Amino acid sequence: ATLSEEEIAMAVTAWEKGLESLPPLRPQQNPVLPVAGERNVLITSALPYVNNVPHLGNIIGCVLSADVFARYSRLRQWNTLYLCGTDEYGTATETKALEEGLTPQEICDKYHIIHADIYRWFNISFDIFGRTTTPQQTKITQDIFQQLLKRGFVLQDTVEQLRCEHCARFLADRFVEGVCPFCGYEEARGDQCDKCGKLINAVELKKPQCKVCRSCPVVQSSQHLFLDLPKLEKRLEEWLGRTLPGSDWTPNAQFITRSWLRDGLKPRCITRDLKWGTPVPLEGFEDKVFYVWFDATIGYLSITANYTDQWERWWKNPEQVDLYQFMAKDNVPFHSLVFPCSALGAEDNYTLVSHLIATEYLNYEDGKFSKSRGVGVFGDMAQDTGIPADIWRFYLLYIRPEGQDSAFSWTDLLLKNNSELLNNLGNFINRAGMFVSKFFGGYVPEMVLTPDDQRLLAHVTLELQHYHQLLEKVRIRDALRSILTISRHGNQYIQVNEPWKRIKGSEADRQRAGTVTGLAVNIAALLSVMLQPYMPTVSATIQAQLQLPPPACSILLTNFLCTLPAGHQIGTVSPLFQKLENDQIESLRQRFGGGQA
Ligand SMILES: [Zn+2]
Ligand SMILES: [Zn+2]
């Protein structure tokens, strides 16, 4: 395409300015804390439930999406804190621990390691990967509760529940049978009678029976606490009306939030009759814990608290901190309604989310991931495929479900690997490094820019600015395509100039070959940095092959610079990517298809 004279002029000028356009990068901090006058970016990924092995769908929607923005944020020299951790409390944990013959603490410890190992293999750059089963979780949850309680946002009511005294617990509708009080059907459930269709309350059943021990449950009244959401609806919508417009909340999250408010919020129970949970500091609640519906989102705070006692500088500092929250759309109500209401009702100057990033679902082939049916790739099986992490990262991010659902496809993975990585991105960077190493003893040639060279340079800068424009608004999927667009321009540039041929010609031809070569390898250097949020290992590999200086590796400016000036010596080059074969892929497809085992 055609650009203005000034656009080209500005691009060339910035490019020639070279390495000292780079600011002397600040030394890393631990713990990372907000700096006044600078941008401070707080990033959370939704806390995965601990006792389920995560699959690719879980990873792309949360930890991997958050990782890309986190890495980009650091390249922009923003003070970045990316945190996550395992969600561990609840009835599900008690049930699963029983099935595995372990204590709740035991099975949680076991599966936390599994999560941590999986995310470590996928190279997720957490600043903290924590847990919700800590004393700080208890302290911070109880504090927020007290603040809400003393401001009249907590209700207390009695609820009639069936209780199996033999099993010593309150029964869910699932585990209750009885006679229908409407038609006399003898096998009615606690939730509904399948004979007459009537939706009932389990407490209304005649001759109720526990499905487990077959004894007779009794109706007992138990005390529960409720969060008074209707009273908080006003201050919540004030905040939303103030922060939603002009934000980068994903459209699906915005619709979901508004749709809940249209129906009107109701008081929600925040207590449960469990043992495994955060204790409630109130009289008569010694055998009750906080419902994970309420305190799971507080986990973000306690995880940060275990990281630094200065955690309030992040989570109680809205004027300084921009919070990004990544999740799948199911988690949206807890992040757009529940915690904001709790925080706003606490009146403790809490940092609320500025940009809620919610994805749609990643499906597997023509259906769902399923552990029970053995369908789909789960996080712990990825390592065993012979396909490295960055390849998984590339494909998942290439098909990241942003506007609509996406589907993992083995055929598509092979096709996009061979076409975009091998025949495009890899083919450019391989040739750029090869030409330097083969024709110039590993030294970057002198670059004498022709008008055509200046055009390409300017095109690269404009696409780079497009890349920034997108990722600034968390347009992950499209920013990856900007990278591939640059390498596409680069391949076209190399192919039309044929430097590997001209190098065998006149001294004029040889100078052209040198210019093309040096310019190409500088584009290769830029790509390595742009690629870092997406494929961190490949990024490091390229930078090692080109011996790109560390300050150039850790910052991405909005202009295309000459990071590899003439005379710079590169290392030893080697093909970046391996092709994927039909035999290899069909074997993997059959393995995770469900037709086996
Ligand atoms: Zn009935
Ligand atoms: Zn029972």
Closest ligand to C-alpha of residue 180 is 1
Q: Residue 190 C-alpha to ligand 1 middle, in angstroms?
A: 11
Beta-carbon contacts of 107 under 8 Å, excluding residues fewer than 6 positions away, are 51, 93, 96, 97, 100
3 state DSSP class of 573: coil
Q: Residue 178 C-alpha to ligand 1 middle, in angstroms?
A: 10
Q: Residue 216 C-alpha to ligand 1 middle, in angstroms?
A: 20
Strand 206-210 relative to strand 218-227, pairing: unpaired
State which H helix or E strand residue 152 sits in: none
Q: Which candidate, 122, 130, 125, 128, places its Cα nearest to that of 70? A: 125
Q: Residue 169 C-alpha to ligand 2 middle, in angstroms?
A: 8
Report how far apart, in Å, the C-alpha atoms of 509 and of each of 249, 390, 451, 455 are.
53, 39, 16, 20
Which residue carries 């603040």 as its tokens?
A: 147
Report how far apart, in Å, the C-alpha atoms of 99 and of each of 94, 95, 133, 297, 490 are.
9, 6, 20, 27, 57
Give the largest Cα separation in the chain, rounded: 100
Tell whether 329 is in a known binding site. Answer: no
Closest ligand to C-alpha of residue 175 is 2
Measured between alpha carbons, how far is 362 from 399 in angstroms, rounded to an integer?
9
Burial grade of 246 (CB within 10 A; 0-12, 13-18, 19 or more): exposed
Phi, psi for 327 (deg, rounded to 5): -170, 175
Contact 250, 357 (CB under 8 A): yes
Measured between alpha carbons, how far is 581 from 422 in angstroms, rounded to an integer?
12
Which residue carries 């975009």 as its tokens?
A: 420
Which residue carries 């035999």 as its tokens?
A: 583
Measured between alpha carbons, how far is 359 from 65 in angstroms, rounded to an integer?
9
Q: Residue 215 C-alpha to ligand 1 middle, in angstroms?
A: 22
Measured between alpha carbons, how far is 578 from 418 in angstroms, rounded to an integer?
8
**Which amino acid, one-letter code, is at 280?**
V
Angle at 108 between CA 105 and CA 113, to 5 degrees: 130
Structure tokens at 35: 């700096």
Structure tokens at 351: 């940092």
Structure tokens at 333: 């109500």
Q: Residue 196 C-alpha to ligand 2 middle, in angstroms?
A: 26
Q: Residue 168 C-alpha to ligand 2 middle, in angstroms?
A: 7
Displacement of CA 528 from its chain's centroid (Å): 22
Strand 188-189 relative to strand 206-210, pairing: unpaired
DSSP 13-79: HHHHTGGGGS--PPPP-SS----TTS-EEEEEE---BTTS--BHHHHHHTHHHHHHHHHHHHHTT-E
Q: Residue 119 C-alpha to ligand 2 middle, in angstroms?
A: 40
Strand 154-164 relative to strand 218-227, pairing: antiparallel
> Count of CB atoms within 10 A of residue 98's CB?
12
Structure tokens at 562: 């000459």
Structure tokens at 64: 């991997």
Contact 406, 399 (CB under 8 A): yes
Measured between alpha carbons, how far is 345 from 232 in angstroms, rounded to an integer?
7
The backbone region for 564, taken as left when phi is positive above 0, alpha when psi lies in -120 to 50, beta otherwise, is: beta
Measured between alpha carbons, how far is 75 from 77 in angstroms, rounded to an integer?
5
Q: Residue 175 C-alpha to ligand 2 middle, in angstroms?
A: 8
Measured between alpha carbons, how far is 428 from 497 in angstroms, rounded to an integer?
13
Measured between alpha carbons, how far is 568 from 560 in angstroms, rounded to an integer?
17
Q: Residue 226 C-alpha to ligand 2 middle, in angstroms?
A: 27
DSSP 498-554: -HHHHTTS-HHHHHHHHHHHHHHHHHHHHHHHHTTTT-HHHHHHHHHHTT--HHHHS
SS3 for 262-305 is HHCCCCEECEECCCCCCECCCCCCCCCEECHHHHCCCHHHHHHH
Measured on CA atoms in the order 582, 429, 548, 43, is the torsion positive or negative? Answer: negative
Q: Residue 192 C-alpha to ligand 1 middle, in angstroms?
A: 8
Measured between alpha carbons, how far is 329 from 39 in angstroms, rounded to an integer?
27
Closest ligand to C-alpha of residue 215 is 2
Contact 169, 273 (CB under 8 A): yes
Measured between alpha carbons, how far is 377 from 119 in angstroms, rounded to an integer?
14
Strand 206-210 relative to strand 176-179, pairing: antiparallel
Q: Residue 273 C-alpha to ligand 1 middle, in angstroms?
A: 29
Verify cis geometry, omega within 30 degrees of 0, for the bond prior to 31: yes
What single DSSP character describes residue 199? B
The backbone region for 190, taken as left when phi is positive above 0, alpha when psi lies in -120 to 50, beta otherwise, is: alpha
CATH label of the domain that carries residue 444: 1.10.730.10
Q: Taking ligand 1, which is a single-atom ion, which protein residues have CB atoms under 5 Å away?
A: 180, 182-183, 185, 193, 195-196
Q: Residue 194 C-alpha to ligand 1 middle, in angstroms?
A: 7
> Count of CB atoms within 10 A of residue 471's CB?
24
Q: How many CA atoms lie within 13 A of 252 on its CB side?
A: 17
Measured between alpha carbons, how far is 159 from 224 in angstroms, rounded to an integer?
7
Q: How many CA atoms lie within 13 A of 533 on its CB side?
A: 30
Q: Please, which experimental method was used?
A: X-ray
Closest ligand to C-alpha of residue 209 is 2
Q: What's the resolution in A?
A: 2.0
Contact 118, 276 (CB under 8 A): no
Report how far apart, in Å, the C-alpha atoms of 535 and of each of 31, 72, 329, 576 are.
25, 12, 25, 12
Measured between alpha carbons, how far is 493 from 458 in angstroms, rounded to an integer?
13
Measured between alpha carbons, how far is 315 from 340 in angstroms, rounded to an integer?
12
Structure tokens at 286: 């010694």
What residue numbers bound the domain in which 460 lies? 5-20+420-569
Q: Which candidate, 51, 149, 68, places its Cα nearest to that of 59? A: 68
Measured between alpha carbons, how far is 104 from 94 in angstroms, rounded to an integer?
6
State which H helix or E strand residue 162 sits in: strand 154-164
Q: Residue 170 C-alpha to ligand 2 middle, in angstroms?
A: 9
Structure tokens at 59: 């990873």
Q: Residue 218 C-alpha to ligand 2 middle, in angstroms?
A: 11
Strand 406-408 relative to strand 362-364, pairing: parallel
What single DSSP character describes residue 106? H
3 state DSSP class of 572: coil
Beta-carbon contacts of 554 under 8 Å, excluding residues fewer than 6 positions away, are 25, 74, 75
Closest ligand to C-alpha of residue 200 is 1
**DSSP alpha helix (H) spans, 399-535:** 410-416, 426-439, 451-471, 476-497, 499-502, 507-530
- In angstroms, how far is the first alpha carbon of the chain from the final one? 54
3 state DSSP class of 90: coil
Q: Which candidate, 443, 457, 584, places its Cα nearest to that of 523? A: 457
Closest ligand to C-alpha of residue 204 is 1
Q: Residue 39 C-alpha to ligand 1 middle, in angstroms?
A: 62
Beta bridge partners of 223: 158
Which residue carries 């509708």 as its tokens?
A: 173
Q: Which candidate, 335, 475, 466, 324, places its Cα nearest to that of 403? A: 475
**Which amino acid, one-letter code, is at 323?**
L
Closest ligand to C-alpha of residue 181 is 1
**Which amino acid, one-letter code, is at 127?**
D
Closest ligand to C-alpha of residue 186 is 1
Q: Residue 177 C-alpha to ligand 2 middle, in angstroms?
A: 11
Measured between alpha carbons, how far is 308 from 81 in angstroms, rounded to an integer?
12
Closest ligand to C-alpha of residue 198 is 1
Structure tokens at 287: 């055998």
Structure tokens at 139: 């302290």
Q: Residue 190 C-alpha to ligand 2 middle, in angstroms?
A: 14
Measured between alpha carbons, how far is 562 from 226 in angstroms, rounded to an integer?
61
Displacement of CA 560 from its chain's centroid (Å): 28
Closest ligand to C-alpha of residue 166 is 2
SS3 for 309-367 is CCCHHHHCCCCCEEEEEEEEHHHHHHHHHHHHHHHHHHCCCCCCEEEEEEECCEEECCE
